[PDB]
Each structure stands twice: as structure tokens, then as C-alpha cells.
Symmetry: C2
Subunit: 137 residues, 2 copies
Amino acid sequence: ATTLFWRPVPVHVKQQDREDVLEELTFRILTGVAKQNHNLRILRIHISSDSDLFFLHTLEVSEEDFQSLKNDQEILVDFASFPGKIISLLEKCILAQPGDSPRFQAVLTIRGGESVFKIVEINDWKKLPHITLAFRP
Amino acid sequence: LSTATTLFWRPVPVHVKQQDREDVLEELTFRILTGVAKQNHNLRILRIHISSDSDLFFLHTLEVSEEDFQSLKNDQEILVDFASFPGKIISLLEKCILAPRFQAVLTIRGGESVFKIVEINDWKKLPHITLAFRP
């Protein structure tokens, strides 16, 4: 395994039927091979809280899974360059300030068994979805 | 319709996605019409017509009544109102005409068609607007 990213990121957490709450969530991005298959390279992303044990959101994307994600999210680069672009988007959310425009925000809509993570760019008339991922508790 | 005003009427280079085969680049005429339907509580209506450029053509139409615009406003996470919406769309359409960073994309989704304007950046096709049209 290789930790390519490990630091807190400002995320607007949307709990079920509860208004948005800005929280500092820890993001761990790791790479390597699959546990039950060393012929398959995988990407693992961990969303956690330093003040909650039950708050764990994971996401595994293998090079096979990426081929569907590449078409779904309309990504131009390859699987190797994918974690870098995620890190870049996560960096913008960290450096983002309530005054500047356009502003990048990290959003996590949490439900039962599934949670949707989004990073949007808020311009003058719309929120532009830079990335959309699905995480499991 | 009362006080009808055609805000937009010109062909646009559109990438019409083919499924089993390579997608084709086709010029489609986009018409944006706004007006007042006094038959419906004087509520305003926004019509967008997409048609191919030939004597034999297809016609897909999108209608949004102003009280229904909040549905679209929620789906696409739009921050402006019904009146400011056409201006943003026209702006994106013109960017597609000029050369490519911005491209117009039309794909099939069941019995409907999905129009989309994307911005080619450094790693993906950033969707600036996604609309559903009905034949």
C-alpha cells in the first residue's frame, strides 16, 4: 500500500434529514493491489472523523472498475493519473474561502449503506460537478 | 402564446453520440422561445427546440413553465432564476460555436434525448448543463 494523501478536508456533511454541517473530515488516499487478487491494481479512499468511530466511508476502484467510471464521469486521463486529479480537487476545497469566487466545496450526502461524495465549483449561476463518487460505510 | 420572443435561433455544432459506432459531428438548429401562457394563469413558458438541418428532420422540444423551473433549478443546482436562465444557456451555446474547450453533446436516453454542454479541461469533460428533451 502507498499513502498518496493523508490530511483533513473541509466537507459539507449532509446527514439524513438534517441541514448542512461544515466539518473537518480526514481523507486517506491509498494505492496498490487488490487483497484477493495481485493481478489487479486498486485505489482506496478513506473518509473518516477524528471524533467518531462509526464514521467510516471507504471506496475501492480497481483498473476494471475505472473503465466504467471513466465513461460515466467522462474522464480523459488514465487510471494512473486519476488519484492526482482527485488530490488537486481536494486541495482546492482546503484552500477555499467564504469570500472568493468561484469556490470549490466538498459535499458528502450520507444515507444507509451508501454515501455520495461530490466536489463542485460554484460560479456565478451554477454548481459545476467536478467529480462524483460512491462510498460505503 | 402572448408576448412571444425568440431569444435564440442559429445552428450549433453538436456531437451526436453514436452507441455501437463512432459519434458524429452534426449542425443542429437551436431555438429558444419565451412567452406568456394566459391559458395557464399567465405563467411564463420557456421553449427550447432542437432540430437537424435538412428537409427531413427530427424535432426535440423542452418546455419549462416558470413555476416548474425550480425542478430544473434543483436538478442542475442552478443559482439563478427562471428569467436569468436563458442568458446562461445562450452564452454556453455561443462558446460551442466558437471552436475545442466547449462542446455541445446530444445523446439518446430511452425514448428521450439528453443534451449537454461540456467544458474540456485538463482531465475530464466538465458538464456545464444537462437537459432532457422529448421527441
